Amino acid sequence: MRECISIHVGQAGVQIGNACWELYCLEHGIQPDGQMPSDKTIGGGDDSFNTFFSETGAGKHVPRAVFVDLEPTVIDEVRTGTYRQLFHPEQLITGKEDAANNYARGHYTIGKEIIDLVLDRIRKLADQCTGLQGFLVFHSFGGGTGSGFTSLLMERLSVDYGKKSKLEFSIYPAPQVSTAVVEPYNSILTTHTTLEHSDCAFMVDNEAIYDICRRNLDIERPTYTNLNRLISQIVSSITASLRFDGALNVDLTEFQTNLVPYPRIHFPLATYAPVISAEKAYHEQLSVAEITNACFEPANQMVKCDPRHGKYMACCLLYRGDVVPKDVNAAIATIKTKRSIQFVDWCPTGFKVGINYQPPTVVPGGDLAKVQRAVCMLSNTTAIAEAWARLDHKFDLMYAKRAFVHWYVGEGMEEGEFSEAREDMAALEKDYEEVGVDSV
Amino acid sequence: MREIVHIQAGQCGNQIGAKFWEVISDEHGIDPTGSYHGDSDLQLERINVYYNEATGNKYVPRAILVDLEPGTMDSVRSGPFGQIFRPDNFVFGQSGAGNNWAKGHYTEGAELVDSVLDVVRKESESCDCLQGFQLTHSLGGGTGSGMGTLLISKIREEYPDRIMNTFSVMPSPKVSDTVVEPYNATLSVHQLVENTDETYCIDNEALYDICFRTLKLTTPTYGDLNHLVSATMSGVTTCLRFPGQLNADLRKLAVNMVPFPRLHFFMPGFAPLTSRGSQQYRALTVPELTQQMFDSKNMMAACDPRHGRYLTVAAIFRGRMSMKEVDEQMLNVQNKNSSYFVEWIPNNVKTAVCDIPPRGLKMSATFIGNSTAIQELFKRISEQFTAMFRRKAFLHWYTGEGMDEMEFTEAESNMNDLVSEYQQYQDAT
Amino acid sequence: LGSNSQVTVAVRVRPFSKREKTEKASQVVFTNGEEITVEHPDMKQVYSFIYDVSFWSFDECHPGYASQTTVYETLAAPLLDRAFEGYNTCLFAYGQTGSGKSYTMMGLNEEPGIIPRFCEDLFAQIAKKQTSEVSYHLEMSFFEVYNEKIHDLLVCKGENGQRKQPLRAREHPVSGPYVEGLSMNVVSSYSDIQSWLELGNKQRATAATGMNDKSSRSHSVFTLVMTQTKTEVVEGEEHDHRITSRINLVDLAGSERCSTAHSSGQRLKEGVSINKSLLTLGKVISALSEQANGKRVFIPYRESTLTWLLKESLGGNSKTAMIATVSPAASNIEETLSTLRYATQARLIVNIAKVNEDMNA
Ligand SMILES: CC(=O)O[C@H]1C(=O)[C@@]2(C)[C@H]([C@H](OC(=O)c3ccccc3)[C@]3(O)C[C@H](OC(=O)[C@H](O)[C@@H](NC(=O)c4ccccc4)c4ccccc4)C(C)=C1C3(C)C)[C@]1(OC(C)=O)CO[C@@H]1C[C@@H]2O
Ligand SMILES: Nc1nc2c(ncn2[C@@H]2O[C@H](COP(=O)(O)OP(=O)(O)OP(=O)(O)O)[C@@H](O)[C@H]2O)c(=O)[nH]1
Ligand SMILES: Nc1ncnc2c1ncn2[C@@H]1O[C@H](COP(=O)(O)OP(=O)(O)NP(=O)(O)O)[C@@H](O)[C@H]1O
Ligand SMILES: Nc1nc2c(ncn2[C@@H]2O[C@H](COP(=O)(O)OP(=O)(O)O)[C@@H](O)[C@H]2O)c(=O)[nH]1
Ligand SMILES: [Mg+2]
Ligand SMILES: [Mg+2]
């Protein structure tokens, strides 16, 4: 049995989790209470698969989640909401003392009182698993919880488990939009601690999804719900191979070995192209080639970066529904000819591929269409060197004057730990121009 | 659960406090008898913040009244919402401050602050988790300024890992309502600059101009001024009481607004504020509120943001809304009005958004700015002082209660240092 | 009145400490005579730092081994000769925990540092010149900074668990800052200082931390006010005009990370304060350097307590000295760069020091 433990840190992680579990529970048939009528309708089966759920002898299907956070205004919405009879009451909220948007508070002072319990619950979730493949941490670079507590947990699990994938979906900071004056610091301080343990750190930006919704759904007032639903769809497409049967099935160890060439360039971008209203559902064929070309469209990315300011280094393309293979191979041929989509001299293949036979779900009250051929892509480029450089410069304009550091020293951080976390990111940005230098 | 201890020192403080409790009780569903008579369920979930449960599901606030004359105590207890407090928290005395800072910090506050700190110890040790404090006072007199500064010092010695938010009615340029304003304000600034985490500077001339121009009021009393101030005080601490999409408590704002530990004096500001008649001629959207909050005419601190550069700005929205419009509008403000911000902070804004708006509104918002204009206030206080101190205007009424000339020179030097620290960031680097 | 004076800075390496010797640490810092170079284990780049004096204490027989009686005759003896004309002087020590600053200034019982050498050589340099013409006075006090609270160390604390009265600081309009309640005791001979230091250091809040067996959790300041009453051309009364000098000797606390120095409870609560004070003792050096270029700036003196007292020492009327002590292990590479990048900053500070003399009036 395959199994994955989805961990959800901070407000962003929990809200993405809410969307994710709404989605999974619609996909399988498990209801919010936790019951599964489909075991009693036809006679039985595996209707809600044990990779992302559990079973209890009475029939309450129970998820493998942890749902950590350090302020209770969010998990208490879960306890009091529709998805209250589903989760196990051990949801490891503190009740106390939010991380104040500094790494220090979530890493050393207010994050040491709960991590000894997270490990207990994860042990209890893993000892009840016959075959554990990895983790899925959903956090947000920018705050103290999702920067520090994730870094701490990913250092403790690297010791405990070690031989298991530790993948991490993250809300990457945008160049222009920001909700804090301290996101560059937190991000630089986070990568330092997660460029050594994590094995694939998937990234998204909210600016990209704003623009996606604008151009492709006719939403001029998008909120976080509709964003987190698209993230939920990415999390379904990355998981569809474990919960369904298909032709090419990509386990969670089959990304780590196909997208991370070097152990530090493991920050891939994501994208999910058929974003369409019910209006433009019609007036579109929605075939494989249209999508695969739409997935390499710069204005259909989920990260504010130009793919043409770099070169691709890996691609994993995962389809859902009525997809035949040569409709893909034709499309990868269409993409291996275009001069704009430029690959490295050292990765000629660069086109991992997966197919699956369950189409996507659609939630009521949603902003997405019923589509018989959904697609996701996970790319590894040299474009995010410029984003990392922008964060480096944001940092360098502030650490020059040592601004906001007296609020980090306060909670257990020395001033030499900012210069030690800035050197590593410069080394990385140099390891992004070491790779685009063509070989002789 | 996060928890605040409200202290009310002086006539101004107690009036604004009463007005604030009348607002929070309306917001949470509490009658003057401490009984819950609300409609929703999002009111009780986070009622531990400002209130404590008594016996029969009756609610008593964590107010600690304080004064040296018993004149406003009786104005409260006789008032409408005054039978909700706790009589053993109406600490008072006699022998008023005489609008003397010496009397309030050395003579008649030295004889009463221990009782106040006993009540503070009692209300703070009765708490699962403390987030900080909230004192209202008035630079210009002796009770508020003196006694509150002393209390802040003793607490920040006793509870130093906690917030000490302070809501202060500063003195105004054109008109005085107390004749020894500069001395008192300078001393209180010497005490708060060194012992606070966030100070909110309110000025009554700005509120007068609001009430005359925006609200189109003809006979505006002080109850109206406090109905304005209570609003933003409410809003600084609503993501601790209600849920939302981006949640921002006090420590978050203190981390994202204070670059250096001294420049924590802020221009506050409210949202929707419109004339009673002219609300049908207006739209209720985030751009309306962004252009209503980033204006000179909707502040309280009597200081022009156009004569400075915003080091920081924070915006706490309350209502069902989009964050695209929030981020885009704040970015438009950073981009268009670039000369009113700082270069070495790439994004000078913070956005917090909540879900439950106030009683009869669908969209409210609360503005907390840190600008280099505030120095002007201090500059004035460092000029009036210099004309009164160079000749020792009213100084024998301060020396005569155990004070020395050194305590004035120090304060002057420190306030001027603060002005210079706000000023060096006023240039183009 | 006054002269331009580049702030003096010196650098000094320590031999491999016992714990890092058990870990089998790789040497990273080297001296090409004066210039220091730091190579990583990565050897991706090689930073180089230049100073005015570069000591060396790795092993006792390297050519260039500056001992404890070499960091006097090169650094502190000029500060002694410059306090005979009348200039105020200072000598303060930066570094990290285990970098060896409380072993340089004060030494150990068999290896004495600068305080004993300074005092005993001064009294040796006074009885060589003292006559019936000009007098020689000396007073001394010895205070510490613990968790943003000043404390005196030469106040014999007796019968209570907290005989630790917290004193306060104040700003004199002309004489600059000063501490209120500071025992300023009088001395005549080196035998009088050894009994104060013997008591003061026993009172200094030391503790046992992972970085070293006896780790100071305080900044210590040590004053010596020497006033000489001179005689010269007059009408009547002589012994009137007098030249005054203030020698401050400062031994700081260290950067200390929480992982490298296993600590909880109270040790972690003063760790934060050392770090905030030394976070502000950096801004004061950085921003004073930025004054050399004409760029108008504000020096955040009042952000902490120590940089508020030593305000006439860094700028102001003081001929100052920064001894900078750094470790040679590769585990201490992410903190030695921080020390040396501030030492190179301190050299650019120009402060105006003037002989102090007041005629009777
Ligand atoms: C039809 C309608 O919606 O009436 C509105 C109204 O039209 C206006 C005039 C209200 C009105 O506000 C004032 O008249 C006012 C007077 C002096 C000082 C400040 C305000 C209103 O009184 C204010 C009051 O606002 C509230 O209900 C909030 O809950 C407000 N209330 C109180 O503070 C309060 C005080 C004492 C007793 C009971 C409630 C509030 C604001 C912030 C935080 C909590 C509560 C409301 C809906 C209105 C009237 C009644 C006209 C406005 O004010 C506020 C704070 O929202 C003025 O602009 C807004 C919205 C409207 O323009
Ligand atoms: N996509 C998405 N991003 C969010 C959401 N909520 C917050 N964010 C982003 O996450 C960033 C950091 O905020 P949080 O993630 O809530 O901070 P945190 O991880 O919870 O840590 P704390 O500050 O202690 O609460 C913000 O700047 C937002 O850009 C969300 O619901 N969806
Ligand atoms: N040059 C040197 N030669 C020999 N031993 C030295 C030298 N420098 C330092 N040491 C030893 O290193 C140890 C630590 O020195 P110490 O002066 O306590 O560092 P420190 O900076 O005081 N620690 P802290 O006060 O917490 O910063 C002492 O026991 C010294 O004997
Ligand atoms: N907003 C408001 N301000 C007040 C009120 N009463 C006094 N003030 C202001 O407070 C200052 C005087 O403070 P005061 O109340 O006399 O302080 P105290 O006598 O020491 O308690 C003046 O500048 C007034 O403008 C009030 O009811 N509301
Ligand atoms: Mg949060
Ligand atoms: Mg020491």
Side-chain angles (χ1 to χ4, degrees), chain B residues 157 160 260-262 406-407 409-410 413-414 417-418 420-421 423-424 427-429, chain C residues 149 168-173 178 269 283 295-300 302-303 308 311:
Chain B
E157 175 51 33
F260 313 98
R262 277 162 68 97
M406 196 193 291
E407 188 161 8
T409 312
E410 290 178 50
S413 298
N414 203 1
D417 293 10
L418 201 73
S420 293
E421 218 177 315
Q423 186 169 352
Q424 70 176 354
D427 295 331
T429 193
Chain C
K149 291 169 201 309
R168 52 191 296 262
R170 295 199 100 177
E171 191 182 4
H172 200 279
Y178 88 93
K269 190 174 171 293
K283 293 178 191 178
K295 165 52 162 187
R296 90 196 196 75
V297 70
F298 199 67
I299 310 303
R302 316 207 196 207
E303 274 180 19
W308 176 231
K311 164 173 186 297

Side-chain angles (χ1 to χ4, degrees), chain C residues 277-345:
Chain C
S277 53
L278 297 172
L279 175 55
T280 56
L281 179 53
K283 293 178 191 178
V284 75
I285 291 161
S286 70
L288 279 173
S289 52
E290 290 183 11
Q291 283 193 353
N293 302 89
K295 165 52 162 187
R296 90 196 196 75
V297 70
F298 199 67
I299 310 303
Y301 284 121
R302 316 207 196 207
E303 274 180 19
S304 168
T305 297
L306 189 69
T307 43
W308 176 231
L309 309 171
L310 313 180
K311 164 173 186 297
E312 297 285 350
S313 304
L314 297 169
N317 55 346
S318 178
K319 266 182 148 58
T320 173
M322 188 188 184
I323 190 152
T325 83
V326 293
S327 172
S331 149
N332 321 121
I333 192 168
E334 58 265 16
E335 311 200 349
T336 285
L337 270 294
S338 86
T339 296
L340 295 190
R341 283 189 206 158
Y342 273 118
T344 189
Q345 271 176 8

Side-chain angles (χ1 to χ4, degrees), chain C residues 101-103 204 206 214-218 251-254:
Chain C
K101 60 191 93 80
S102 307
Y103 185 84
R204 175 160 191 200
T206 50
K214 265 175 325 311
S215 78
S216 74
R217 318 293 300 162
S218 307
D251 184 76
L252 302 180

Side-chain angles (χ1 to χ4, degrees), chain A residues 144-197:
Chain A
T145 312
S147 70
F149 193 79
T150 301
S151 280
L152 205 79
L153 189 53
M154 295 273 258
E155 190 185 1
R156 293 281 208 101
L157 287 164
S158 178
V159 171
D160 301 329
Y161 291 77
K163 282 282 169 199
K164 309 216 178 272
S165 285
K166 295 176 280 176
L167 317 175
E168 66 184 344
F169 299 181
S170 308
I171 303 306
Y172 190 65
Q176 289 271 268
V177 173
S178 281
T179 56
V181 306
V182 303
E183 300 196 349
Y185 284 177
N186 295 3
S187 194
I188 279 154
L189 284 159
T190 319
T191 308
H192 179 227
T193 64
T194 49
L195 197 63
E196 300 166 333
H197 301 116

Side-chain angles (χ1 to χ4, degrees), chain A residues 9-13 15-16 69-71 74 97-102 139-147 171-172 177-180 183 204-206 209-210 224-225 227-228 231, chain B residues 245-247 252 327 351:
Chain A
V9 169
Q11 202 168 15
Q15 288 151 340
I16 286 154
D69 183 16
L70 302 168
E71 64 181 1
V74 185
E97 296 294 290
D98 189 274
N101 279 356
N102 53 5
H139 57 119
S140 168
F141 291 157
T145 312
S147 70
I171 303 306
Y172 190 65
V177 173
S178 281
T179 56
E183 300 196 349
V204 302
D205 184 17
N206 288 330
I209 308 170
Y210 297 160
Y224 283 164
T225 62
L227 275 49
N228 300 335
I231 308 190
Chain B
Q245 294 286 345
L246 290 178
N247 274 322
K252 227 175 181 162
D327 294 333
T351 68

Side-chain angles (χ1 to χ4, degrees), chain B residues 19 22-23 26-27 215 217 224 227-228 231 234 270 272-274 276 279 318 358-361:
Chain B
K19 198 36 84 154
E22 193 171 335
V23 157
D26 218 74
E27 208 123 64
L215 305 171
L217 272 165
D224 303 2
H227 188 316
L228 257 163
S234 199
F270 202 50
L273 282 181
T274 162
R276 218 149 242 201
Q279 57 135 38
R318 315 187 37 181
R359 204 104 220 101
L361 259 68

